[PDB]
């Protein structure tokens, strides 16, 4: 009986492949070979945010484009004023193994987690004047790879147990459990409309999920190795994945397949972060070759390079106002570029 | 800056001060990962070490032997990304074993990991009394051209076993600090301390070019 279901799955996979081929009439490169080159984009280090005692694993911006949260193997979570290189806060964590950080879209909360299995949500706005653990969301079996906020009351997480989860913060229960990955889920990104989100998961696949339904809407593949980064094109109908095979890629949700692949022959190093600029013309990819490259997102060309980290660029993020790009590396330095 | 930014800068300077305090505390703290299928050996060594130097998932252990902060992590391809500020790896392997194949497969996996390239490796061999007990009633492993001496004195058996963990290593120049371990704990702590010290000396000199 099992062979029947397996063969039906194979037939459906063939239908999916054929339908994706049938829509691939022309590529983004054949359409943008006539558009103006983005040029020699070389922006500088404006701020060098230093103070962490070890490697930074995650950074996240505020919606105000000024405040910045960073989680480090120190067991610390520092909130910085990017304009002035001030430390707004230092949050000591119960576990030194923090892999992700989030900054609430309203600025009230931050989040962290890691090999401690538990998603820790911190309240910044207390009359007691201290950041305190507002909740410890429990329910994951492995490490917490990335955590993202929708509003102040609910948060989406992904773990190293092949499982994502939409938590209601007040009650601490998984209001929805997103299952379907076959590997460790590493990086997830939310749509700006905050109704869909995608997950990348060390199984050569990323998935578009609906948050209000709990079902995996679409399954994208094409990578040969672990999708270690993900981010939406800033309108919610394209995203880009970086992976240990040293290749970024751009997927369109409506076309359900790739559009343009960003790989250079001299880059044999893995990809640790991906982000888009405000308009989506620039694609920033942090690499393990101690570097971060800037891609013309519509031509697969290299616009430029943010050289200037002394070890792996583990995180990067672009402000909501577009002014700055902030990169965090395992050299304890977080740098603002504009 | 004016009248609120000066105060914010004072706050940030205080946070920098606290972070520098903890860097002073941390940069002295050396990490020794623990691995191996000998869970009982892991527990026994942990208990003895904490008894001397104190007086689920990952199970950290903090103590201080000779004024030197040890963090025995006691743990997988993603976990090890977080573990390259480490100064050694221990394997708890029971000398009385088959289980030697299993242990050396695990050691082969761990020993050559790229993230652990600059990490010295200590192979803690456990229950050597049980090893001589199984030498008296010879347990013969006949799957390698090393049975020559197998039904003989314990020393040949130990040499074969220690080679078996020397076997399956592909990144040498940082030697395996093999020990033959018993129930006395002071010598165990001494082994750990001496191995970590030699590792740091060699790294300092090699990176200072002698």
């Amino acid at each position, epitope marked *: 009986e099992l062979d029947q279901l397996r063969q039906e799955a194979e037939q459906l996979k063939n239908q999916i492949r054929d339908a994706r081929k049938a829509c691939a009439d022309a590529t983004l490169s054949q359409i943008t070979n006539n558009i103006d080159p983005v040029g020699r984009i070389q922006m500088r280090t404006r701020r060098t945010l230093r103070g962490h005692l070890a490697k930074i694993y995650a950074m996240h911006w505020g919606t105000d484009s*000024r*405040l910045l949260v960073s989680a480090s193997q120190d067991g610390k979570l520092i909130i910085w*004023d990017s304009y*002035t290189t*001030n430390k*707004v*806060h230092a949050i000591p964590l119960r576990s030194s193994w923090v892999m992700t950080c989030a900054y609430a879209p309203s*600025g009230n909360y931050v989040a962290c987690g890691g090999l401690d299995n538990i998603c820790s949500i911190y309240n910044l*706005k207390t*009359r*007691e*004047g*201290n950041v305190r653990v507002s909740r410890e969301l429990a329910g994951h079996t492995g490490y917490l790879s990335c955590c993202r906020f929708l509003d102040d009351n609910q948060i989406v997480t992904s773990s190293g147990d092949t499982t994502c989860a939409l938590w209601d913060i007040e009650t601490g229960q998984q209001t929805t459990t997103f299952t379907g990955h076959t590997g460790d889920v590493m990086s997830l990104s939310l749509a700006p409309d905050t109704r869909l989100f995608v997950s990348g998961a060390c199984d050569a696949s990323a998935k578009l999920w609906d948050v209000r339904e709990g079902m995996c809407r679409q399954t994208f593949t094409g990578h040969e190795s672990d999708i270690n980064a993900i981010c939406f094109f800033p309108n919610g109908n394209a995203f880009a994945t970086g992976s240990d095979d040293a290749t970024c890629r751009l997927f369109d949700l409506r076309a359900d397949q790739e559009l343009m692949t960003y790989s250079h022959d001299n880059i044999i190093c893995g990809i640790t972060s991906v982000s888009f600029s405000k308009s989506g013309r620039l694609l920033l990819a942090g690499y393990d070759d101690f570097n971060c490259n800037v891609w013309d997102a519509l031509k697969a060309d290299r616009a430029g390079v943010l050289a200037g980290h002394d070890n792996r660029v583990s995180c990067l993020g672009v402000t909501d106002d577009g002014m700055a790009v902030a990169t965090g590396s395992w050299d304890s330095f977080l740098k603002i570029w504009n | 800056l*004016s*009248a*609120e*930014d*000066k*105060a*914010a800068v*004072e*706050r940030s*300077k*205080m946070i920098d001060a606290l972070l520098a305090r903890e860097r002073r505390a941390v940069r002295r703290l050396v990490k020794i990962l623990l691995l191996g299928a000998d869970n009982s050996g892991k527990s026994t060594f942990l208990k003895q070490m904490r008894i001397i130097h104190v007086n689920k998932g990952i199970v950290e252990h903090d103590f201080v032997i000779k004024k030197i902060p040890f963090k025995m992590v006691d743990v997988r391809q993603k976990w090890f990304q977080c573990f390259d500020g480490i100064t050694s790896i221990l394997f708890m392997v029971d000398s009385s074993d088959n289980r030697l194949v299993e242990s050396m497969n695990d050691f082969e996996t761990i020993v050559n990991n790229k993230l652990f390239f600059n990490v010295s490796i200590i192979l803690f061999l456990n229950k050597m009394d049980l090893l001589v007990e199984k030498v008296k009633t010879v347990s013969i492993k006949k799957h390698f051209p090393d049975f020559r001496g197998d039904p003989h004195r314990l020393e040949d058996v130990q040499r074969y076993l220690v080679q078996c963990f020397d076997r399956k290593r592909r990144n040498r120049s940082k030697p395996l600090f093999h020990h033959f371990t018993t129930s006395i704990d002071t010598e165990n702590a001494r082994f750990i301390f001496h191995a970590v010290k030699d590792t740091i000396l060699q790294e300092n000199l090699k990176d200072i070019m002698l």
Partner: single-chain antibody
Amino acid sequence: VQLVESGGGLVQPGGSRKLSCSASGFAFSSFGMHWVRQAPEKGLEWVAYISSGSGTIYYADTVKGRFTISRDDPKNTLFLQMTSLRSEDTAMYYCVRSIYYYGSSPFDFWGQGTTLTVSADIVMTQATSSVPVTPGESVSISCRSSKSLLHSNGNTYLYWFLQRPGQSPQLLIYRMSNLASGVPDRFSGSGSGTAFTLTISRLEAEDVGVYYCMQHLEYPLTFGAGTKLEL
């Protein structure tokens, strides 16, 4: 949160006194502390300030080297050592919490205060001492600034405070535009450098009282006379 102040009473002219402030329910060592005066029938004046970490200390012109502010963090106590008091020091003193990071709300919690009886600077002018008002109608108050409060940072460091009859002041607007936590949203404020106005839609009972304006552009902090809203 709670700041219970102790040390009041009657002092003969001259002499010395030591006001203490017991903080309870918040992380004292992360906060700045201000000492704020209020004359028996008058507006409220600023006195002194100690920072988080006791790093910096600021005073008014009438108390410099005459008063000393200190904090003992482990016991959660703020001290004001008053030396050589005069008949003009007769006032109610309040301990005013403050915190300074991007987006913080300084001057947020004001203590119950202690009564002490003794037997250039940015000028801010209150438009009028009192206003006839009626519940349900929107009202406006104003002060004038002798010096543009819009610092180059873009923030206009101006504060509006409310003291109900017989109670301790409550922050109402910080930096000329933002509302404090616990304040109804019917309060709002606006203005620019050298003139600013507070607007209330649907003033009700318990909105009676005195509205004060402070500058925080540069110590010393100077206060207006405050307008009284009377039903």
